[PDB]
Protein: KIAA0730 protein
Organism: Homo sapiens
Amino acid sequence: MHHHHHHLVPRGSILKEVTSVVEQAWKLPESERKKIIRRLYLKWHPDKNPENHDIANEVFKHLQNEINRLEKQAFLDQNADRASRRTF
């Protein structure tokens, strides 16, 4: 531990909020689990936003990658193969 300097200045605390709600939804089995992603996926939608086309698309970019990122690691772990797939 040294602590010298760090860069952390969001536009309005929009990213840090998504990182919390996303981790909280990763505790439920699946029913209510995915239910949380559907709320933020629609709530933070550009088409739903009144006048936030870019502001919405921005948060969406971080949310989209935040899902598959955990959805893949929180599912594919020790299962004979390694997501190779040979059936098609």
